[PDB]
Symmetry: C2
Subunit: 281 residues, 2 copies
């Protein structure tokens, strides 16, 4: 209950879920989903959003242990919920084609709506598209994709940050003036552009590095991140606006971002309003 | 409500480990590692062996559930142990670069030697090389690899069976007349060749499709496989020799294969014998 020791994961050797204690403070049986009401949604049947998810669950800490993480279910499904009520479909992909990995210990087991939306897309989450395929066939200048969504969760720190494919997707999004939606640790994917001065000047909100440096103190993670995504993003032009977290979000042109596992709902509202305004015109 | 019902895995939703019953029958606290001493081993320090492991653990069954699989620890470590004692070194790799996945419910916990070999390479398994990087710098006519080992476990049925990177590796191995070593469901990876009749006429042993159709009756899997790797291999020219399993190993030129989780030791012996002769002129 009050136990702060990391909790061992039976599936992997030397891997741990967050501590029972960190779990009682950072996870809840229900989400704060609300406002997903769009009286006049898009009904074109065309525009859909491409979801790029984490495909690995075990993240290596600075002490040799594995953090049992992945994408955050609340951060992932709340935004998808709003966009769904808005009238948008989703295509789900990972770098390897392997199943999308969620931090189930963060899933609100009592949220009917959140579990409802998930049931609807489980087949896609569990049998995703291989990103390389989406790139070779579903992008270009006349894509049915109106935006790209990269959910948070430390699982977003593996693969995506230095992937040549994610880079093509981002470059496409920026070149075809498409919406890029992310929150928490999701912006780490942006580092994929490597040395491209593509995002120079952009303003985003993202989980604060200083907080990652503190969470292990209560056994949230079995150790510390081997690097800090926040400084890297900054290194390539991004202006991180938030010093702390509050579930806030920001829009810089078509770049929409949330600051933490508290920003899901707000992001879903923002993306919804921004996209509905894009298409209703 | 019974010991033959699949065992829930807390890390993945709707995924299961084998049932308690199947585990007591198909796994052991100790392995049968034996005859691993080589009086006159290799001492050159060059010849190395490339391991291509599983990066995914959750395999989709026909009923929608996930079988919590991965590489088989005994099929993996018994061959490595002999080759380690024979004087050879290893390079461990996965398609994506992500951690190698073992079916930890099969690891013989009371076995010192095997647990010792695992701890020796633990950092390579947890942080392996990415197969693309190997193909781009460690192959060729002057490669230090004297062979390629593709361990079994139903985890080898994902990604490997149709990976271009893997096709490249297998053509290299054949092209360069290197050793190809595999067992159980490992030969599934051979399918990465697709159309190429590169293996026409080759004889091997592998886990019978027939048995994959039976093990679920006792809860070894939470469902049935959605395709048969045996019939597939036959489709591209291989001749599967065993109708059952008994630890049988086979050698067709430089193709070395085992038929089941019972062929680990026998395969380590064969590979070490075959390879030591290969390094003496």
């Amino acid at each position: 209950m009050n136990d702060k020791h990391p909790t061992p994961d039976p599936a992997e050797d030397n891997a741990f879920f967050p501590s029972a204690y960190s779990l009682s403070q950072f996870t809840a049986s229900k989400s704060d989903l609300s406002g997903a009401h769009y009286p006049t949604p898009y009904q074109g049947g065309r525009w859909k959003i491409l979801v790029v998810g984490a495909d690995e669950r075990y993240l290596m800490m600075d002490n040799g242990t594995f953090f049992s993480t992945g994408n955050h279910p609340v951060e992932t499904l709340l935004p998808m919920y709003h966009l769904d009520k808005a009238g948008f479909s989703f295509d789900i992909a990972t770098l390897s084609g392997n199943p999308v990995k969620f931090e189930w210990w963060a899933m609100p087991r009592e949220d009917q709506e959140v579990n409802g939306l998930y049931s609807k897309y489980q087949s896609s989450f569990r049998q995703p598209l291989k990103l390389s395929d989406v790139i070779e066939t579903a992008l270009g200048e006349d894509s049915d994709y109106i935006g790209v969504f990269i959910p948070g969760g430390h699982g977003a720190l593996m693969g995506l940050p230095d992937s040549q494919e994610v880079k093509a997707v981002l470059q496409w999004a920026m070149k075809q003036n498409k919406f890029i939606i992310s929150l928490c640790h999701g912006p780490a994917a942006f580092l994929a552009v490597g040395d491209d001065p593509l995002f120079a000047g952009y303003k985003i909100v993202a989980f604060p590095d200083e907080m990652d440096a503190q969470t292990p103190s209560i056994g949230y993670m079995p150790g510390h991140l081997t690097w800090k995504f926040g400084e890297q993003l900054q290194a390539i032009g991004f202006e991180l606006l938030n010093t702390g977290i509050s579930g806030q979000v920001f829009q810089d042109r078509k770049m929409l971002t949330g600051d933490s596992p508290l920003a899901g709902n707000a992001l879903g509202q923002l993306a919804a309003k921004a996209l509905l305004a894009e298409v209703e015109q």
